[PDB]
Structure 1
Amino acid sequence: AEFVPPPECPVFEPSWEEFTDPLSFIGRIRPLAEKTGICKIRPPKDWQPPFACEVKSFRFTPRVQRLNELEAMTAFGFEQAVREYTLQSFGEMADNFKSDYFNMPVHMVPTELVEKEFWRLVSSIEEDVIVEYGADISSKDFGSGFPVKDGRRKILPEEEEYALSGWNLNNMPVLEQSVLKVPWLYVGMCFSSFCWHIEDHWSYSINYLHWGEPKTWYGVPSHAAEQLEEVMRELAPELFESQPDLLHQLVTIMNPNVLMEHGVPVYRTNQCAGEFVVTFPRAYHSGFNQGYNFAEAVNFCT
């Protein structure tokens, strides 16, 4: 009955010589990481970029997420309106929610317990849990989490190495080669989540957790992409089974154990603060946040 955690995805701890640039490093770990869909990269201990967002003016209006909206299928539409938070007020709400839900301090809740409870609530018909996710935040609004030589914020000399680092997500190559843009920010709370999807143009994605509680990931290697899609449309509601992929993946919520029972390989990881997660081309991924955190992500091409 309880959720069975998938096997762990690869974690790489490159030395300073192995940490030269992401594109060269990702190309070398590709033979292994492409067979798991996702991988985690822990930078050297001394690589600690400062948080360079405008915290004083950071204001956002997160989306409302009903965990059991798909199982609730079998007044609607006015359950909770989308409201504005500051970055401080969102953290107070997030910490209060998690501590009250588990009856424990937020830092004492085991990651396995949040994981087991998240997947129970997704399929629960007797308990309706509703959370919020600050998912629509462009780095052009209040600045990137990384220091950027933009001219709209002061950069200290000890922070210039991070403004010029290849692992700064603002310095990733994003232009696709053809005959014929900026990172996004994610302010999470406990149970806020994203369902199974791949990137537009089957692009890579790189994700950095600036601070906060871990972000739990699930990934499927690209060689099983068509197997996952077949399981999805087999078990999806009939009203959504015929929808185009770009629209269907707005509601492709599925317990990883269900995919594993159908033979789909799934890997998991807990991304901690200061760690990177890379998703490979056509690697389906999903996840949820363990608590109040702040992430930055961008799609890149090779």
Structure 2
Amino acid sequence: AQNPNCNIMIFHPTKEEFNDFDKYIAYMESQGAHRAGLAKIIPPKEWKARETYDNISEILIATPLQQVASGRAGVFTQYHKKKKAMTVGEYRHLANSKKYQTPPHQNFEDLERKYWKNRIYNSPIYGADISGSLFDENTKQWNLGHLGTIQDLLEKECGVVIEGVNTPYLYFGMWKTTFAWHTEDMDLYSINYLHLGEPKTWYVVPPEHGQRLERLARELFPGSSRGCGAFLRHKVALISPTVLKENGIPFNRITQEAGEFMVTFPYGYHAGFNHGFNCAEAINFATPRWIDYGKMASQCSCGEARVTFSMDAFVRILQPERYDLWKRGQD
């Protein structure tokens, strides 16, 4: 068995190997990459996502989210308070202000220490979940707006034709902006490209151990757990690496830098934070190996998780027993 310790693997495809996205994903899995839940892909030196970022300040962040924490430094939830719209140029200036800017630090490890010590005492503003793309239309390799759709994968594997679309999302971050512990909708893959700016630190639990993280989360967030049998779908809970280590939960960590891709694999729980002003692009995708994960994915029916249009068909076809309850949650 490849990668039996579930380490995060880093790949360096050549320009030839970067042509065929599906083939490369299947290669990485042949080497055991999925066992970690997360992999890094460094593009060949010949590749670029677009020519420059000199012209992005006019993108609108219609609903910036202030991420307000409750709890203790290592175990907390965050809620998203909606803020007035602002442009990317306005948001970058805010990120760089004395109130929000990255503190002085020695290296990524020192910054990580400072994040876990101090996150809860601040409320950073995240421009998350913005439909759109920064890849040039002429970029033909690993262009996250030109991937094969999940609907087409389901159709190719299962023969069923369904409604829905699959488009990318932009994320504008600042110091301490946080993504809570989650797997993807329907335990899909994700791919995330860091277009510019400061790094993103990731934490990940191997898919084979995801239920260990779920059991700890039920213990740590007991009221939330009574409220919903899949409350990590709410994407509000944080648990630090120190707390994970104290409770014996297997995990790994890695820092993504500008110009790098990360792939999350089906049922790979992940969480993390931004180091400073940055911009990422991410999308969900599927492969044949996902189908079985999609069939078994948990679902929130309490009403909190509220998701896209396109998840309806996935539930309806892969999980027809759950469909009626899940749809009540959506309505």
TM-score using structure 1 length: 0.79
Q: Name the SS for the 2:90 alignment partner.
A: helix
Q: Relative contact order (C-alpha < 8 Å, sep 6+): which is higher?
A: 1
In the TM superposition, what is the alpha-carbon distance from 1:62 to its structure 2 partner? 1.0
* 8 Å CA contact 2:190, 2:283 repeated in 1: yes
SS of 2:72's equivalent? coil
Report sequence identity in percent: 38
**Correspondence 1:48-67 to 2 at 5 A:** 48-50=48-50, 51=52, 55=56, 57-60=58-61, 61-66=63-68
CA–CA distance in 2 between the matches of 1:174 and 1:258? 38
Structure 1: how far apart are the matches of 2:101 and 2:7? 29
Gapped regions of structure 2 (runs ≥ 5): 1-5, 288-331
| Matched ranges for 1:134-153 at <5 A | 134-139=127-132, 144-148=133-137
1:172 maps to amino acid: L
Q: CA deviation at 1:278?
A: 0.1
Name the CA shift for 1:182/1:129 in 2 (closer, same or farther; >3 Å): same
Preserved contact between residue 137 and residue 184 of structure 1 (Cα < 8 Å): yes
Tell me the distance in 2 between the aligned counterparts of 1:236 and 1:196: 12
Matched with 1:186 is: 171
CA distance in 2, matches of 1:185, 1:39: 20
Aligned equivalents of 2:233, 2:186: Cα separation in 1:
16
Q: State the one-letter code of the partner of 1:62.
A: P
Alignment of 1:1-302 (within 5 A): 9-30=8-29, 31-50=31-50, 51=52, 55=56, 57-60=58-61, 61-66=63-68, 68-71=69-72, 82-97=83-98, 102=103, 104=104, 110-122=107-119, 128-139=121-132, 144-148=133-137, 160=138, 162=139, 164-165=140-141, 167-176=142-151, 177=154, 178=158, 179=160, 180=162, 181-245=166-230, 249-302=234-287
| d(CA) in 1 for partners of 2:28, 2:224 | 41
In 1, are the aligned partners of 2:67 and 2:81 still within 8 Å (CA)?
no
Distance 1:133 1:99 in 2: 11
Aligned 8 A contact 1:208 1:276 in 2: yes
| 1:14–1:90 CA distance, 2 compared to 1 (3 A) | same
Query: Which amino acid is 1:264 matched to?
Result: I
- Provide the aligned length of Structure 1 versus Structure 2: 266
Superposed CA offset, 1:171-205 (max 9, x none): 11222415351000000000001100011111110
Mapped partners of 2:223, 2:81: distance in 1:
27
Runs (5+) with no aligned partner, structure 1: 1-6, 149-159
